[PDB]
PDB file of C-alpha atoms in Angstrom:
ATOM      1  CA  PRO A   1      -1.732  41.918  40.186  1.00  0.00           C
ATOM      2  CA  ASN A   2      -2.879  39.960  43.537  1.00  0.00           C
ATOM      3  CA  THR A   3      -4.449  41.584  46.476  1.00  0.00           C
ATOM      4  CA  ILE A   4      -2.760  40.506  49.980  1.00  0.00           C
ATOM      5  CA  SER A   5      -3.647  41.623  53.208  1.00  0.00           C
ATOM      6  CA  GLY A   6      -1.960  40.136  56.331  1.00  0.00           C
ATOM      7  CA  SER A   7       1.105  38.301  57.376  1.00  0.00           C
ATOM      8  CA  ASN A   8       3.034  35.777  55.428  1.00  0.00           C
ATOM      9  CA  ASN A   9       0.572  35.436  52.527  1.00  0.00           C
ATOM     10  CA  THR A  10       1.996  34.617  49.039  1.00  0.00           C
ATOM     11  CA  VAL A  11       1.081  33.908  45.503  1.00  0.00           C
ATOM     12  CA  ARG A  12       3.942  32.051  43.649  1.00  0.00           C
ATOM     13  CA  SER A  13       2.242  32.130  40.090  1.00  0.00           C
ATOM     14  CA  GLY A  14      -0.931  33.662  39.135  1.00  0.00           C
ATOM     15  CA  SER A  15      -3.188  36.644  39.071  1.00  0.00           C
ATOM     16  CA  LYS A  16      -6.201  38.489  40.481  1.00  0.00           C
ATOM     17  CA  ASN A  17      -6.085  36.411  43.886  1.00  0.00           C
ATOM     18  CA  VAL A  18      -7.306  37.847  47.081  1.00  0.00           C
ATOM     19  CA  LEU A  19      -5.700  36.711  50.248  1.00  0.00           C
ATOM     20  CA  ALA A  20      -6.419  37.816  53.642  1.00  0.00           C
ATOM     21  CA  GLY A  21      -5.069  36.597  56.974  1.00  0.00           C
ATOM     22  CA  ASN A  22      -1.934  34.745  57.697  1.00  0.00           C
ATOM     23  CA  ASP A  23       0.035  31.995  55.947  1.00  0.00           C
ATOM     24  CA  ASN A  24      -2.232  31.667  53.041  1.00  0.00           C
ATOM     25  CA  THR A  25      -0.520  30.640  49.749  1.00  0.00           C
ATOM     26  CA  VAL A  26      -1.642  30.155  46.078  1.00  0.00           C
ATOM     27  CA  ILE A  27       1.029  28.201  44.421  1.00  0.00           C
ATOM     28  CA  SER A  28      -0.443  28.286  41.132  1.00  0.00           C
ATOM     29  CA  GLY A  29      -3.655  29.830  40.070  1.00  0.00           C
ATOM     30  CA  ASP A  30      -5.959  32.727  39.464  1.00  0.00           C
ATOM     31  CA  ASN A  31      -8.899  34.357  40.742  1.00  0.00           C
ATOM     32  CA  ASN A  32      -8.985  32.641  44.007  1.00  0.00           C
ATOM     33  CA  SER A  33     -10.360  34.338  47.252  1.00  0.00           C
ATOM     34  CA  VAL A  34      -8.654  32.801  50.422  1.00  0.00           C
ATOM     35  CA  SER A  35      -9.311  34.124  53.883  1.00  0.00           C
ATOM     36  CA  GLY A  36      -8.128  33.028  57.296  1.00  0.00           C
ATOM     37  CA  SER A  37      -5.170  30.991  58.430  1.00  0.00           C
ATOM     38  CA  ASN A  38      -2.639  28.554  56.818  1.00  0.00           C
ATOM     39  CA  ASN A  39      -4.940  27.682  53.562  1.00  0.00           C
ATOM     40  CA  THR A  40      -3.212  26.539  50.433  1.00  0.00           C
ATOM     41  CA  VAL A  41      -4.513  26.594  46.830  1.00  0.00           C
ATOM     42  CA  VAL A  42      -2.083  24.344  45.151  1.00  0.00           C
ATOM     43  CA  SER A  43      -3.170  24.421  41.337  1.00  0.00           C
ATOM     44  CA  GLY A  44      -6.502  25.878  40.992  1.00  0.00           C
ATOM     45  CA  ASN A  45      -8.718  28.802  39.661  1.00  0.00           C
ATOM     46  CA  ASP A  46     -11.928  30.547  40.862  1.00  0.00           C
ATOM     47  CA  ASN A  47     -11.983  28.976  44.346  1.00  0.00           C
ATOM     48  CA  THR A  48     -13.377  30.445  47.542  1.00  0.00           C
ATOM     49  CA  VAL A  49     -11.720  29.186  50.465  1.00  0.00           C
ATOM     50  CA  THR A  50     -12.329  30.334  54.220  1.00  0.00           C
ATOM     51  CA  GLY A  51     -11.148  29.005  57.523  1.00  0.00           C
ATOM     52  CA  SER A  52      -8.117  27.163  58.478  1.00  0.00           C
ATOM     53  CA  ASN A  53      -5.805  24.513  57.124  1.00  0.00           C
ATOM     54  CA  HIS A  54      -7.407  23.879  53.687  1.00  0.00           C
ATOM     55  CA  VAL A  55      -5.671  22.350  50.592  1.00  0.00           C
ATOM     56  CA  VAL A  56      -7.409  22.989  47.505  1.00  0.00           C
ATOM     57  CA  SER A  57      -6.804  22.278  43.837  1.00  0.00           C
ATOM     58  CA  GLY A  58      -9.031  22.512  40.664  1.00  0.00           C
ATOM     59  CA  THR A  59     -11.798  24.982  40.085  1.00  0.00           C
ATOM     60  CA  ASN A  60     -14.793  26.771  41.481  1.00  0.00           C
ATOM     61  CA  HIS A  61     -14.923  25.229  44.857  1.00  0.00           C
ATOM     62  CA  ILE A  62     -16.373  26.754  47.987  1.00  0.00           C
ATOM     63  CA  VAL A  63     -14.391  25.243  51.026  1.00  0.00           C
ATOM     64  CA  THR A  64     -15.058  26.445  54.390  1.00  0.00           C
ATOM     65  CA  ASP A  65     -14.608  25.469  58.232  1.00  0.00           C
ATOM     66  CA  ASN A  66     -11.173  23.514  58.702  1.00  0.00           C
ATOM     67  CA  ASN A  67      -8.917  20.905  57.361  1.00  0.00           C
ATOM     68  CA  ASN A  68     -10.437  19.969  54.130  1.00  0.00           C
ATOM     69  CA  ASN A  69      -8.597  18.517  51.195  1.00  0.00           C
ATOM     70  CA  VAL A  70     -10.610  19.248  47.951  1.00  0.00           C
ATOM     71  CA  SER A  71      -9.959  18.775  44.325  1.00  0.00           C
ATOM     72  CA  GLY A  72     -11.874  18.517  40.910  1.00  0.00           C
ATOM     73  CA  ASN A  73     -14.632  21.023  40.188  1.00  0.00           C
ATOM     74  CA  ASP A  74     -17.430  23.052  41.604  1.00  0.00           C
ATOM     75  CA  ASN A  75     -17.346  21.119  45.163  1.00  0.00           C
ATOM     76  CA  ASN A  76     -19.087  22.866  48.141  1.00  0.00           C
ATOM     77  CA  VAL A  77     -17.337  21.526  51.395  1.00  0.00           C
ATOM     78  CA  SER A  78     -18.077  22.484  54.893  1.00  0.00           C
ATOM     79  CA  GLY A  79     -17.238  20.963  58.325  1.00  0.00           C
ATOM     80  CA  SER A  80     -13.842  19.184  58.751  1.00  0.00           C
ATOM     81  CA  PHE A  81     -11.229  16.835  57.666  1.00  0.00           C
ATOM     82  CA  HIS A  82     -13.029  15.919  54.476  1.00  0.00           C
ATOM     83  CA  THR A  83     -11.282  14.595  51.215  1.00  0.00           C
ATOM     84  CA  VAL A  84     -13.427  15.385  48.265  1.00  0.00           C
ATOM     85  CA  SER A  85     -12.608  14.933  44.680  1.00  0.00           C
ATOM     86  CA  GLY A  86     -14.802  14.922  41.416  1.00  0.00           C
ATOM     87  CA  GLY A  87     -17.505  17.157  40.507  1.00  0.00           C
ATOM     88  CA  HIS A  88     -20.381  19.003  41.962  1.00  0.00           C
ATOM     89  CA  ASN A  89     -20.494  17.370  45.253  1.00  0.00           C
ATOM     90  CA  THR A  90     -21.858  19.007  48.351  1.00  0.00           C
ATOM     91  CA  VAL A  91     -20.348  17.507  51.546  1.00  0.00           C
ATOM     92  CA  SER A  92     -20.762  18.617  55.242  1.00  0.00           C
ATOM     93  CA  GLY A  93     -19.969  16.914  58.619  1.00  0.00           C
ATOM     94  CA  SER A  94     -16.670  15.524  59.290  1.00  0.00           C
ATOM     95  CA  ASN A  95     -14.291  12.905  57.960  1.00  0.00           C
ATOM     96  CA  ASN A  96     -16.064  12.130  54.731  1.00  0.00           C
ATOM     97  CA  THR A  97     -14.465  10.673  51.561  1.00  0.00           C
ATOM     98  CA  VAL A  98     -16.308  11.691  48.580  1.00  0.00           C
ATOM     99  CA  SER A  99     -15.512  11.150  44.720  1.00  0.00           C
ATOM    100  CA  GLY A 100     -17.396  11.011  41.629  1.00  0.00           C
ATOM    101  CA  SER A 101     -20.174  13.686  40.758  1.00  0.00           C
ATOM    102  CA  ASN A 102     -23.502  15.243  42.191  1.00  0.00           C
ATOM    103  CA  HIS A 103     -23.355  13.686  45.444  1.00  0.00           C
ATOM    104  CA  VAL A 104     -24.860  15.273  48.730  1.00  0.00           C
ATOM    105  CA  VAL A 105     -23.150  13.822  51.727  1.00  0.00           C
ATOM    106  CA  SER A 106     -23.832  14.788  55.363  1.00  0.00           C
ATOM    107  CA  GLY A 107     -22.843  13.244  58.620  1.00  0.00           C
ATOM    108  CA  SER A 108     -19.653  11.597  59.558  1.00  0.00           C
ATOM    109  CA  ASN A 109     -17.108   8.853  58.411  1.00  0.00           C
ATOM    110  CA  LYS A 110     -19.007   8.399  55.064  1.00  0.00           C
ATOM    111  CA  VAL A 111     -17.360   6.914  51.882  1.00  0.00           C
ATOM    112  CA  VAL A 112     -19.089   7.802  48.746  1.00  0.00           C
ATOM    113  CA  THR A 113     -17.944   7.330  45.080  1.00  0.00           C
ATOM    114  CA  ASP A 114     -18.910   6.869  41.500  1.00  0.00           C
TER     115      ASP A 114
END
């Protein structure tokens, strides 16, 4: 039902997830692809999550690098230590806080909302 390769990866509830690496978890969700170390999809579907220490909920995100906290729908997040919600945001750099929709945010320490 799920495809799992590595050490200490788990899916509590859901199907068709693909988890590779170590200590990755899908709490509740389907069709997520998660690769790396210590990443977590809490409640979400169809997310692509690569790198380390991400926490992701919602749908259709692409999250990479490290330590990003992402919820909502269709956010594309790179760099580190971001907090992103809402929809269709594109976030790079470090330590940005982004909510609302359709924002493209780069650099560091930015706060952007609807």
